[PDB]
Design a protein around this ligand. Structure first.
Ligand SMILES: O=C(O)CNC(=O)c1nc(Cl)c2ccccc2c1O
Ligand SMILES: [Fe+2]
Lengths: 7, 215
């Protein structure tokens, strides 16, 4: 799925 | 305006109320113009794809391609200001903690930079996240100077669900936009006759995302 970045 | 104020007095109430929020002159000319240059540099240097296959027929020498994209993390060389935009979007969302619906945003996608080349292509009506993949909020930053939709087209038309009318948003320079990514906001990009740039970032809701692979 879409890569997720922690902000 | 300070992000927290922009968030608390504008973003939060607009979103919970309409599900769509527009912020003009988000970063100012100097910063907005630099983002434009970095984006245009990526384009001129070939970082973008060739464009979505719109018309795929028989003699592919005349295939028509539309929107071109490239994923930006923000730490790439020559993308510093883009990286700065992403941090600015993050601060606003961060300040909206626990106020955008009952969502709890724990992360986002990389920035998707799009370039509608200006060959009359647009984007069909769609829902960004129709199957609960976790994306709850869509954030788009436009960088098109003196954009005149009357001659260049490229209007973003959103069809709010509990409504008969639709909202037309022009991809204006230094404009920042927010809208629920789900079924509440089906939208479309009308055909663009001039090069049109936009930078998109989707924010994830921790719970929807966490169960995304088992629901
Ligand atoms: O740019 C705009 O004003 C509106 N754009 C979109 O709604 C949009 N949505 C999706 Cl899911 C994609 C997806 C891929 C490439 C471009 C997209 C796009 O421009
Ligand atoms: Fe979209």
């Amino acid at each position: 799925m879409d890569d997720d970045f922690q902000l | 305006l300070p992000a927290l104020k922009l968030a608390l007095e504008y973003i939060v109430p607009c979103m919970n109320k309409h599900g769509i929020c527009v912020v003009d002159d988000f970063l100012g000319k100097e910063t907005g113009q630099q983002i434009g240059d970095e984006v245009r540099a990526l384009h001129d240097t070939g970082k973008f794809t060739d464009g979505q296959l719109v018309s795929q027929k028989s003699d592919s020498s005349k295939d028509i391609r539309g929107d071109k994209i490239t994923w930006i993390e923000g730490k790439e060389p020559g993308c510093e200001t883009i990286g700065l935009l992403m941090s600015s979007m993050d601060d606003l969302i961060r300040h909206c903690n626990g106020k955008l619906g009952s969502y709890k945003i724990n992360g986002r996608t990389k920035a998707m930079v799009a370039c509608y080349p200006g060959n009359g292509t647009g984007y069909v009506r769609h829902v960004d996240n129709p199957n609960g993949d976790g994306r709850c909020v869509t954030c788009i930053y436009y960088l098109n100077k003196d954009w005149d939709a009357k001659v260049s087209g490229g209007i973003l038309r959103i069809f709010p669900e509990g409504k008969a009318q639709f909202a037309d948003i022009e991809p204006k320079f230094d404009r920042l936009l927010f809208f629920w990514s789900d079924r509440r906001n089906p939208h479309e990009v009308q055909p663009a006759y001039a090069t049109r740039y936009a930078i998109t970032v989707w924010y994830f809701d921790a719970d929807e995302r966490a169960r995304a692979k088992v629901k």
